[PDB]
Amino acid sequence: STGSATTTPIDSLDDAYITPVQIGTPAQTLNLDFDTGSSDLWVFSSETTASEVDGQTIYTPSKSTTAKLLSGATWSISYGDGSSSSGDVYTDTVSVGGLTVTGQAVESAKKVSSSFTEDSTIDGLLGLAFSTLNTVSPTQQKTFFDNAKASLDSPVFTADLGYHAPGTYNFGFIDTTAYTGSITYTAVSTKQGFWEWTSTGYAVGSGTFKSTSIDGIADTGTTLLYLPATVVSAYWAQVSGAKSSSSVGGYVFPCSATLPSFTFGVGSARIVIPGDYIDFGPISTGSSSCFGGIQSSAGIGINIFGDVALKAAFVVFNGATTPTLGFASK
Ligand SMILES: CN(Cc1ccccc1)Cc1cc(C[C@H]2CNCC[C@H]2CC(=O)Nc2nccs2)no1
Numbered sequence: 001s002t003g004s005a006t007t008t009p010i011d012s013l014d015d016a017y018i019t020p021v022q023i024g025t026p027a028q029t030l031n032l033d034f035d036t037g038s039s040d041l042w043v044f045s046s047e048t049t050a051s052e053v054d055g056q057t058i059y060t061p062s063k064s065t066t067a068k069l070l071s072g073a074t075w076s077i078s079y080g081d082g083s084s085s086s087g088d089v090y091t092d093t094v095s096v097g098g099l100t101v102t103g104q105a106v107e108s109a110k111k112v113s114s115s116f117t118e119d120s121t122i123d124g125l126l127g128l129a130f131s132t133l134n135t136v137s138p139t140q141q142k143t144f145f146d147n148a149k150a151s152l153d154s155p156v157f158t159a160d161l162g163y164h165a166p167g168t169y170n171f172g173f174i175d176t177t178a179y180t181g182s183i184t185y186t187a188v189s190t191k192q193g194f195w196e197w198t199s200t201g202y203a204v205g206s207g208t209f210k211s212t213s214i215d216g217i218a219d220t221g222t223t224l225l226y227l228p229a230t231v232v233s234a235y236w237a238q239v240s241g242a243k244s245s246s247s248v249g250g251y252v253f254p255c256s257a258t259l260p261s262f263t264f265g266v267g268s269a270r271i272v273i274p275g276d277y278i279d280f281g282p283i284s285t286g287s288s289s290c291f292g293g294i295q296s297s298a299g300i301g302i303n304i305f306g307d308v309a310l311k312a313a314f315v316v317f318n319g320a321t322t323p324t325l326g327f328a329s330k
Helices: 144-151 229-236
Strands: 003-010 017-023 028-035 041-043 070-077 084-096 098-112 123-127 156-160 167-171 184-187 196-204 210-218 225-227 244-247 252-253 260-267 271-274 279-282 288-293 293-297 302-306 314-318 324-328
Touching: 003 084, 028 041, 041 084, 070 098, 144 244, 184 229, 196 229, 229 279, 229 293, 244 302, 252 293
Parallel strands: 028 123, 041 098, 210 302, 225 293
Antiparallel strands: 003 017, 003 167, 017 028, 017 084, 041 123, 070 084, 084 098, 156 167, 156 314, 184 324, 196 210, 196 260, 225 302, 244 252, 252 288, 260 271, 279 288, 314 324
């Protein structure tokens, strides 16, 4: 089997991407944030505290004839910012782009933090990291990809995120028309539960490539590119007027600037992020100070190849017995 679904930016800045997912019988379609940095499939639901729902579509398990309460199971997640959610668990039928999993754990939110309530366009998350990170207790549950894997034509999924445009998540096959040149594969460590890999270095604009190992995670659920302070400083030094602002919480730059590209290494291959991918617009409405899309990872503890990086590539998440990651230009 295979699946193919379109993923769509939630706003004009590509802050996140939503992908429609069918849950239950009859289908209830929710727009989920596919997140390769986490491993829970959780949704706003009929059980979510009413005051914490503001526009989201909800999953109502009582209306699904294939929903079964997973007795005693709870979940609770705290993501890397300050956001959180928690609740109970059903198993149900879940389909993505024509690919169907029966008995998928669907984690129903009873509580969500304000940041999620404020995201009217995001009905929940679909985790695509390794199942070792799944938070369900007392019996950990598998991700959608792990459940589907054995049935797929090939044990892979791909992310093809658009810049200011829709893109695609494919399961079970490589669309050879979706990229240029070849796919360069690189080793993954699953020790922290992430799609963790090591970039071979970087260039800023037309500058010379710096060979240096940068360990980080491929994370579709993070908006920006978080890299070591030395690398980030080198990038922003090429933008006149750019500075790190403690009050704003990162590098900002004059909205009148032309941003240079940023290149990252994948083995001997090179992925080029165009300068305009690095613009996240005015820090507040009407401001002429703009927020940068490349930021320091120093306060995080890990480097993160988020959407800013990933949307410059066609990315293969290879779930073979020894997983690997593939990157192609497009
Ligand atoms: C990428 N820019 C950088 C920036 C930083 C500062 C100034 C400009 C630009 C940050 C950014 C903004 C947004 C969209 C916002 C929409 N309103 C509510 C807040 C935002 C939505 C949001 O953060 N949801 C969350 N859910 C869970 C955890 S956080 N998503 O990201």
